[PDB]
Amino acid sequence: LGKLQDVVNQNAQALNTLVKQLSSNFGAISSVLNDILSRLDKCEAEVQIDRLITGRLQSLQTYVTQQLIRAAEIRASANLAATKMSECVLGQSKRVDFCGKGYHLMSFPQSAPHGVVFLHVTYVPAQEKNFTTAPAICHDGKAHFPREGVFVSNGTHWFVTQRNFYEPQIITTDNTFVSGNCDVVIGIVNNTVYDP
């Protein structure tokens, strides 16, 4: 939670620096109104107090400007948080890495001091295995392309498998679709397609 603590620390530090800046003379004989008004009458004290007024007003202007910068930063962060809540808590985001590594499934908001926390639950494929693939299968001259998934061989046979999980099933005319003769495709390999 370094971000939220940094925000709180920044605000507190800015206020404390503003208090500390009242010790500056700004060219006047002293940084205290009382000393100026007691040593000098308004005759000569007006100029000193005006110098002090100008300096302290400039200090306030500096503080307000820095606060506006930080407010813009926080507004950008808040807009991002609102977009995340709308697109990840209220929905399922297809944007890659927008909500956590892996394929986003859900998100759970949790309040935090001056901030929000998202628990992005994600699907991460873990145990991979090598396989020999092929873009298409030439059955009897025609080229078979899978509908969804890829053609995969364990060494002997071929199966259609969905892309993010190993659930092979035997080649079939409904799993695939035909498109033209099987001579133009590069990498095509021979096998038979089962037809119910």
Binding site: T17, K20, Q21, S23, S24, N25, S31, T62, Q66, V96, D97, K101, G102, Y103, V124, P125, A126, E128, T133, P135, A136, A143, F145, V150, R163, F177, S179, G180, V184, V185, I186, G187
Partner: protein
């Protein structure tokens, strides 16, 4: 722009019969020059009386230095969050068999001390990057009256970025290798290998067109892609307005 009335009818649709594989180059700033300022050297150059008078403004000067330090750390953070998305430094396979696609100009050149690609070399040569200086030259040949020497003599130093351009090139090369050898899978966890033709087939199925049209036109597509790269190779080589 051009006036272009479009035909419209309740029973008339226009269907494409071909395509072009365009390559568009777009640029984004990521960081800016980190800078540091010495109040004492700038305001009260080396006089002790003026520094003693300035001591009562230590709060102001601490505030300024804190702000500039925050800016510098922010620049380093920006560069890291842009380029170091993945912490697995993949290296391109030695053999270039990507179904006819030619990635020569967007991969590292082994025949250069820096590990940049051709397009990167053009990009770095198209920007001057003038703030680079060695102290001692300012102490020596100052009759030239360089501006950087004045900035340094008035306490306005420029800090170097954390990530060297070679390191950024390494990160970019890792991203390219993962992209062309594993597709989108290396971003969602481990990098899973796939032939590039099947990868571009996945992309074609993504944009809403069947994958077969790729395999029936693969060579053509590859040529188009290469041609598009060639356009970039000249578009960044003649003009400097990009």
């Amino acid at each position: 722009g051009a006036e272009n009335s479009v035909a419209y009818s309740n029973n008339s649709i226009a269907i494409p019969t071909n395509f072009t594989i365009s390559v568009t180059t777009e640029i984004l700033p990521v960081s800016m020059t980190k800078t540091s300022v010495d109040c004492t050297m700038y305001i009260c150059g080396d006089s002790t009386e003026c520094s003693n008078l300035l001591l009562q403004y230590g709060s102001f000067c601490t505030q300024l230095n804190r702000a500039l330090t925050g800016i510098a750390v922010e620049q380093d953070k920006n560069t890291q969050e842009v380029f170091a998305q993945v912490k697995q430094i993949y290296k391109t396979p030695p053999i270039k068999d990507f179904g006819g696609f030619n990635f020569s100009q967007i991969l590292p050149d082994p025949s250069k001390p820096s590990k940049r690609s051709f397009i990167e070399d053009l990009l770095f040569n198209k920007v001057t990057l003038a703030d680079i200086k060695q102290y001692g030259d300012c102490l020596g040949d100052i009759a030239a009256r360089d501006l950087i020497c004045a900035q340094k003599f008035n306490g306005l130093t420029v800090l170097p970025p954390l990530l060297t351009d070679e390191m950024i090139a390494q990160y970019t090369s890792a991203l390219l290798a993962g992209t062309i050898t594993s597709g989108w899978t290396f971003g969602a966890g481990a990098a899973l290998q796939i032939p590039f033709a099947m990868q571009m087939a996945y992309r074609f199925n993504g944009i809403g067109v069947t994958q077969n049209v790729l395999y029936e036109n693969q060579k053509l597509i590859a040529n188009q892609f290469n041609s598009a790269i060639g356009k970039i190779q000249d578009s960044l080589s003649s003009t400097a307005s990009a």
